[PDB]
Amino acid sequence: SPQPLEQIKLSESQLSGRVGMIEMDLASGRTLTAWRADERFPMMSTFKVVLCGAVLARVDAGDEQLERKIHYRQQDLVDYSPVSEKHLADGMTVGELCAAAITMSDNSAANLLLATVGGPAGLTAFLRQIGDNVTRLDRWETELNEALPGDARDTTTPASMAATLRKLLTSQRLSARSQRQLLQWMVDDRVAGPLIRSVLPAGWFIADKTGAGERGARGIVALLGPNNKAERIVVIYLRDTPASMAERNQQIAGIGAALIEHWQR
Ligand SMILES: OC[C@H]1O[C@H](O[C@H]2[C@H](O)[C@@H](O)[C@H](OCCCCCCC3CCCCC3)O[C@@H]2CO)[C@H](O)[C@@H](O)[C@@H]1O
Ligand SMILES: OC[C@H]1O[C@H](O[C@H]2[C@H](O)[C@@H](O)[C@H](OCCCCCCC3CCCCC3)O[C@@H]2CO)[C@H](O)[C@@H](O)[C@@H]1O
Ligand SMILES: *[B]([O])([O])[C]([C]N1[C]=C(C([O])=O)N=N1)[N]C(=O)[C]C1=[C][C]=[C]S1
């Protein structure tokens, strides 16, 4: 594989869309590779990690409990609710909701959680509280996936998202236990985690949250490193490409391959 930046460029050339990419050391925040890192991209379901960061902050403050059981109605459900559609009788705990939202990308779980933090506005306020002055959520699932050209709603930048994830996972804004919980939810991703592991060389750690939307929008926020360590945050977003889902996935993987082959930078 070519160097990371060369492969990123190739992926744009082949997709006819924009790619946005950060690679950042988790422990220090060193930026290693940056491409369109200050340009806006739809977050799609990647927002679910930030959402559960806000939830965990409420837990730490004593305003929320992961044990608390939430009951909801069938008319509350939106498209793609693999876990939440199964618990209409009995409800789900706040922690189960976060697990469903992160590990299965359950849309209704995310919306229920989003209400508890004050909606898109409340999550955006949380982002401002932790010093992210760029990322914004405006809409609920599933409208937030619309990815209209030129629309700043429901967007982040690769740099902002990487910084935000580092802040949530390592900065002690969250309690140790909450940091540990957020990481474990990413480790437990069932949408892409197992597939990613099956194509990674032995020894490479992965934790992730994926997203997909309209107009080609696709993305992943991930922790990756050799010796079975979460060494780096890697954020990759694609937008405005007409390519198949399969080819988008291949291109994201090709960027991954480039990182793996040229890791010591
Ligand atoms: O196996 C050996 C080969 O491994 C890589 O090839 C990669 C390629 O770079 C990537 O484009 C493709 O993607 C295949 C698609 C896999 C999709 C899984 C990852 C997705 C899942 C959903 C979220 C984003 C990531 O895999 C091949 C190997 O199989 C190297 O590029 C190549 O030089 C090397 O000789
Ligand atoms: O020398 C490095 C490695 O080169 C190859 O590994 C290939 C692997 O066979 C292929 O399956 C993968 O595809 C890439 C799969 C990447 C999935 C991770 C996706 C990223 C996306 C962004 C967030 C982090 C995860 O590339 C690597 C590197 O060429 C060899 O197969 C392997 O024996 C060797 O250790
Ligand atoms: B998310 O990206 O907001 C959500 C669910 N989803 C899909 C994936 C994936 O494929 O990796 N991860 N999480 N996306 C949707 O529900 C897609 C929709 C776009 C318009 C209506 S639904």
Ligand 1 pocket test, pick from 190, 196, 199 with the greatest ligand atom count within 8 Å of Cβ, gives 199
Q: Output helix, strand, coil percentages for the chain, rounded to the nearest 5.
A: 45, 15, 40
Domain ranges of the chain: 1-265
Beta strands in the chain (DSSP E): 18-25, 31-35, 41-42, 69-70, 92-93, 155-156, 205-212, 218-225, 232-239
| The CATH homologous superfamily of the domain defined by 1-265 | DD-peptidase/beta-lactamase superfamily (3.40.710.10)
Q: Please, which residues have CB within 8 angstroms of residue 208's CB and are 6 or more apart in sequence?
A: 186, 189, 192, 193, 196, 220, 221, 222, 223
Q: Which ligand is nearest to the CA of 209?
A: 3
DSSP code per residue over 70-127: E---GGG--S--TTGGGGTTT-EEHHHHHHHHHHS--HHHHHHHHHHTTHHHHHHHHH
Is residue 39 annotated as part of the catalytic site, yes or no? no
Is residue 178 annotated as part of the catalytic site, yes or no? no
> Alpha-carbon distance 210 to 76, whole Å?
24
Kindly give the interhelix angle for 176-187 and 158-170, rounded to the nearest 10 degrees. 130
Dihedral of the CA atoms 110, 195, 185, 201 (nearest 10)?
A: -150
Q: What is the resolution of this structure in A?
A: 1.5
Ligand 1 pocket test, pick from 250, 261, 263 with the greatest ligand atom count within 8 Å of Cβ, gives 250
